[PDB]
From Swiss-Prot:
This is Interferon regulatory factor 3. It comes from Homo sapiens (Human). Key transcriptional regulator of type I interferon (IFN)-dependent immune responses which plays a critical role in the innate immune response against DNA and RNA viruses. Regulates the transcription of type I IFN genes (IFN-alpha and IFN-beta) and IFN-stimulated genes (ISG) by binding to an interferon-stimulated response element (ISRE) in their promoters. Acts as a more potent activator of the IFN-beta (IFNB) gene than the IFN-alpha (IFNA) gene and plays a critical role in both the early and late phases of the IFNA/B gene induction. Constitutively phosphorylated on many Ser/Thr residues. Activated following phosphorylation by TBK1 and IKBKE. Innate adapter proteins, such as MAVS, STING1 or TICAM1, are first activated by viral RNA, cytosolic DNA, and bacterial lipopolysaccharide (LPS), respectively, leading to activation of the kinases TBK1 and IKBKE. These kinases then phosphorylate the adapter proteins on the pLxIS motif, leading to recruitment of IRF3, thereby licensing IRF3 for phosphorylation by TBK1. Ubiquitinated; ubiquitination involves RBCK1 leading to proteasomal degradation. Polyubiquitinated; ubiquitination involves TRIM21 leading to proteasomal degradation. Ubiquitinated by UBE3C, leading to its degradation. Deubiquitinated by USP5 on both 'Lys-48'-linked unanchored and 'Lys-63'-linked anchored polyubiquitin, leading to inhibition of anti-RNA viral innate immunity. The gene is IRF3. Belongs to the IRF family. It is linked to Encephalopathy, acute, infection-induced, 7, herpes-specific: A rare complication of human herpesvirus 1 (HHV-1) infection, occurring in only a small minority of HHV-1 infected individuals. It is characterized by hemorrhagic necrosis of parts of the temporal and frontal lobes. Onset is over several days and involves fever, headache, seizures, stupor, and often coma, frequently with a fatal outcome.
Length: 98
C-alpha cells in the first residue's frame, strides 16, 4: 504494497481511529495522536505494510512509530505543520497537504 497517501486519506475519511482526524473542512490538514494496547495508526500501518503480523512478530511500537514517521516525511506533498508531541494533555502532531 500500500501507498501511504491514499491509505492515510482513507483512514481519515473513515474516521475509525481515535484521535486520528481531519482538522479542517477542506481536508488538507489532520491530527495524529503522538507520544514521545495502543492499536492506533502506527500499528495499523505496520499491519497494512506487512511489517507486523500478530503472533509472528513481537509488538514493537517505537519501531512502528519510526517506520511511520519515515513513510510520511518522504512524501513530497506532506509537510509537518505542528509538533505537540511533548504536551501532557493530548500529545499530537498535525500534518498538512501542500
Ligand atoms: Cl472524499
Ligand atoms: Cl492496530
Ligand atoms: Cl497545554
Ligand atoms: Cl495541545
Ligand atoms: Na477523532
Ligand atoms: Na499504534
Ligand atoms: Zn477523501
Ligand atoms: Zn491492528
Ligand atoms: Zn495541535
Ligand atoms: Zn497541554
Amino acid at each position: 504494497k500500500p501507498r501511504i497517501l491514499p491509505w492515510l486519506v482513507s483512514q481519515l475519511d473513515l474516521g475509525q481511529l481515535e484521535g486520528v482526524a481531519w482538522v479542517n473542512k477542506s481536508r488538507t490538514r489532520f491530527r495524529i495522536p503522538w507520544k514521545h494496547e495502543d492499536f492506533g495508526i502506527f500499528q495499523a500501518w505496520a499491519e497494512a505494510t506487512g511489517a507486523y503480523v500478530p503472533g509472528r512478530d513481537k509488538p514493537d511500537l517505537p519501531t512502528w512509530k519510526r517506520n511511520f514517521r519515515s513513510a510520511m516525511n518522504r512524501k513530497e506533498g506532506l509537510r509537518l505543520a505542528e509538533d505537540r508531541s511533548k504536551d501532557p494533555h493530548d500529545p499530537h502532531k498535525i500534518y498538512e497537504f501542500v
